[PDB]
Design a protein around this ligand. Structure first.
Ligand SMILES: CC(C)(C)[C@H](NC(=O)C(F)(F)F)C(=O)N1CC2(C[C@H]1C(=O)N[C@H](C#N)C[C@@H]1CCNC1=O)SCCS2
Ligand SMILES: CC(C)(C)[C@H](NC(=O)C(F)(F)F)C(=O)N1CC2(C[C@H]1C(=O)N[C@H](C#N)C[C@@H]1CCNC1=O)SCCS2
Lengths: 305, 305
């Protein structure tokens, strides 16, 4: 029993973390085979933060200008190129700890773990969601860029996120591992703000199912609802529309608990309209939306890697 | 910016996890040098759960009766003994991935990361606190026992917890790595219940300091308080007494923010007496008490390992 915001084991990613330095700027890099991937703003100068000329900045660099260190070992850079907003530094040594891996581009609503790093060394690991507005609610300081987000399937690490930016109100923006930003963000210091965020409805429902599995059942009412009538209420409280794909994705949890998805929707409708009246669900006074249906099953069934 | 329930990187502990099997019972073990540590109730039978005769059960075991596997590799057991509530299985191979480590017994209020494992493989990592009533609010299923809790200092893993039991209301009990339970719990199936829990006051204050560091400042009032008058209010709301050692431990955060500890105490007093009125602090509608002062500094200053 119990339900926790649980991250993936980070060991496979820890063995890929390095530091990249240009001048006085040090960030993290990700070392896979004989390539180090890092944010291209490592080559920025204090002068030209507002709108860096990345191509000119990179042209003026030689391989020797990139100081790449893995632990206490310097890795010699033998080539370099820019792919969208990331640098690819070819090094003369393949990472012997390279896991089986994939580069993936996740969808809003999906979750992943972040290994927060400084100077190529890990600080901690936590679980995030790609918000509907393509930000993430992370915890990042100066020097954290190049930290990555990931999922693990079995033995395979799917890298989905590399950190680049902090946006107003303390939320975070970054790219996939091909250097393409999630959302309408750019890697320069310019007026940027996320669109209005929304609550990930299918995830709230998955978390309510987790509550039921854990015996926290007080919010279950006697009613049902149509999908359309539910979504009319969801819209008012800034919840995303629930789709039939979402309903089908909740199938395993609905089957395990014997609660039809639309019946859970009726209970969620009542929570939205009436509040929780000082009660908690799984220890929280707010409805949680950063657990996917798959996260709930993984945690409640003990899936390992 | 940002503040997350952040766990330690788990790689060093992942390389120590094995599975131990007796009959049809498989749990996790921790492999350090040439010893595997695991919960002794691995040798239990379905018959004698209410009050197992551990010494008789172990006498009847030979080394060959313990099936210890590291990944897909069987480790041959060459000796075995019982230390309080843990077994020590001597194996013929020293773990080549053994980190620098220490066995420590933590105090209530302190925090650690748990690497939840099944069949010797990790499922996920999360951050816990040793509650004042010597339970932890974990997430554990059948087969999770032998999972361990830990802190990392620099390169050194301090193991502090190994999981044994789930108590009524879905909270968890276990031992240090010398097999001594935290709290008044025993490893048998008998009526056990935790004493009343309390809120870890020094941790709530540390988390309020984290809020201020992140610019979430609305709860700061214009008042101050004496330590004694604060503790009279704390007692009413089931908060632990704040000691002078706690005040001094908050020194770094008080210095960074320029807010005296007793001034923060006045703001916390007002929160306890008046509630939050639907507002949140660092995204939470409840006051959080599972971040220590050291956790806050680590996360807000980017300490690495
Ligand atoms: C938050 C800022 C105001 C400084 C800025 N943000 C924006 O300009 C906004 F998005 F608001 F438009 C921003 O993030 N920058 C500015 C550049 C680098 C990058 C950056 O510091 N990235 C860090 C890494 N390493 C991680 C940051 C540091 C704080 N916490 C994080 O997560 S962009 C390329 C030229 S300098
Ligand atoms: C929860 C129980 C009612 C089953 C029981 N608890 C109690 O008896 C109480 F504490 F309430 F008094 C308990 O935990 N037991 C019974 C024994 C083993 C141990 C146990 O199953 N430990 C698991 C491991 N592996 C981890 C558990 C499984 C569920 N989630 C967990 O965390 S004690 C030694 C003889 S059988």
């Amino acid at each position: 029993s119990g339900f926790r915001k649980m991250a993936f084991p980070s060991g496979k990613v820890e063995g890929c973390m390095v530091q990249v330095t240009c001048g006085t700027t040090t960030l993290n890099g990700l070392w896979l085979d004989d390539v180090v991937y890092c944010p291209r703003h490592v080559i920025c100068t204090s002068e030209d933060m507002l709108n860096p000329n990345y191509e000119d900045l990179l042209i003026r660099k030689s391989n020797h200008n990139f100081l790449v260190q893995a632990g206490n070992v310097q890795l010699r850079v033998i080539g370099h190129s820019m792919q969208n907003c990331v640098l690819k530094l070819k090094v003369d040594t393949a990472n012997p700890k390279t896991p089986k891996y994939k580069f993936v581009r996740i969808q809003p609503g999906q979750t992943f773990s972040v290994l927060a790093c400084y100077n190529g060394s890990p600080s901690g690991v936590y679980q995030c969601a790609m918000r509907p507005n393509f930000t993430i609610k992370g915890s990042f300081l100066n020097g954290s860029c190049g930290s990555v987000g990931f999922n693990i399937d079995y033995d395979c690490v799917s890298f989905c996120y590399m950190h680049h930016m902090e946006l107003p109100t303390g939320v975070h923006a970054g790219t996939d591992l091909e250097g393409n930003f999630y959302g309408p963000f750019v890697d320069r210091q310019t007026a940027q703000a996320a669109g209005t965020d929304t609550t990930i409805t299918v995830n709230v429902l998955a978390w309510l199912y987790a509550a039921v599995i854990n015996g926290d059942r007080w919010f279950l009412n006697r009613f049902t609802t149509t999908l359309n009538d539910f979504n009319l209420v969801a819209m008012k409280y800034n919840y995303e529309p629930l789709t039939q794909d979402h309903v089908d994705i909740l199938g395993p949890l609905s089957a395990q608990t014997g609660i039809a998805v639309l019946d859970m929707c009726a209970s969620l409708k009542e929570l939205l309209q009436n509040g929780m009246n000082g009660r908690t669900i799984l220890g929280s006074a707010l409805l949680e939306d950063e657990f996917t249906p798959f996260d709930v099953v993984r945690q409640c069934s003990g899936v390992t890697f």
